[model samples]
Target: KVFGRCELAAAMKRHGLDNYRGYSLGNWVCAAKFESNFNTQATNRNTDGSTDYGILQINSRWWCNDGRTPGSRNLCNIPCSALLSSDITASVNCAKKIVSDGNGMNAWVAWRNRCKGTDVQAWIRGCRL
Candidate 1:
């Protein structure tokens, strides 16, 4: 149950989906909506008793490795990059990396399957790691 459009948009932006569209974006929005209702501040506790944090609802300790800034110095404060970086592209890339290699693999696969069938394939297929 999304609260409203603004809430949804906030979620999309926080999750790094501000400029996203197409099937990939759709899938991500859908998955995140289902998982966390686009809440960047959402958290959950595991059966093992560990706590997690923010949008995409990353766990606290996991984000500690690369994130060590003021607002986000602790993994639970804010997004790792958002803590220190103002570069939108850098932030977006950080978000993308999280999904591509961090936590959203299934959603990423769904996106690849649906999005790759488009003309976008020609452009993205050539992208190098």
Candidate 2:
């Protein structure tokens, strides 16, 4: 599923991502825009053999176990497949785990470069959330 900009913002907010780990809801919204374009089925295979899954493009190497990524940390304790659901519950949970990491949102390089030091709030400008 491809979520609308505000829809993604509202959905993310409903999952407690607003101000989570000190990153604004707009920051998360911006990350999703660059990471997966709000698509729930996006996937990327990196040269290191790790796969990033779903809307946030969560990596299998450190977050979810995909049976393909070497030395997967499985910090989210869930399969990589779960991140592709349109429901986004699993993805949100895993994203929360990622945010709690010491490096914070920098775990997603897309967020670090595209979402950081930018007008993130513009991503949710039309949303009522």
Candidate 3:
């Protein structure tokens, strides 16, 4: 995994993820936990034949290209593998574009299903960032 709790918080803060736009650091951190357990190398397949990629679990259907997936929107203009790195710069940049579309964090299923409308402070409870 790329990040422990404190490390994730620090990286997110340094990368401007803390309170980004209007969303809280806790929201992003919580979503990351559920999405990939902070695993930069993470990827998952959905029942609908789509895939989720990297730390934020960005979707192949809209946000990235995974080569095999047809009709990928690839709004971020990045290969999905670029997101699966300990250096989260590419992922963070793509995520900024994704959230900029007025979707906020709702673009990720993990955010909606697990982080949204919940007390998510514990995701960064012990972080010193």
Question: Sorted on TM-score, highest at the top, how do the candidates line up?
Answer: 2, 3, 1
Those runs of model 3 whose alpha carbons end farther than 4 Å from true positions after fitting are none
Candidate 1 structure quality by residue, lDDT tens digits, 1-129: 323434444444665664443234444444444445545545565454444443344443444323332233243334443423323333334446555543453433333554334453232232231
Global CA lDDT of candidate 2, please? 0.92
Better of 2 and 3 by TM-score: 2
Candidate with more favorable, higher lDDT: 2 or 3: 2
lDDT of 2 by residue, 58-118 (tens): 9888889999877778999999999999999999998998888788999999999888999
Query: How does residue 49 of candidate 2 score in lDDT?
Result: 95
Better by TM-score, candidate 3 or 1:
3
Please give the range of 10 consecutive residues that has the lowest summed lDDT in model 1: 120-129
- Indicate which candidate wins on TM-score: 2
In candidate 2, what residue range of length 10 has the lowest lDDT sum?
66-75
Model 3 residue 21 CA deviation (Å) reads: 1.6
All candidates in order of lDDT, best leading = 2, 3, 1
How do the predictions measure up, each by TM-score? 0.42, 0.96, 0.92
| Candidate 1, residue 112: lDDT | 51
Question: What lDDT score goes with residue 95 in model 3?
Answer: 89
State which candidate, 1 or 2, has the greater lDDT: 2
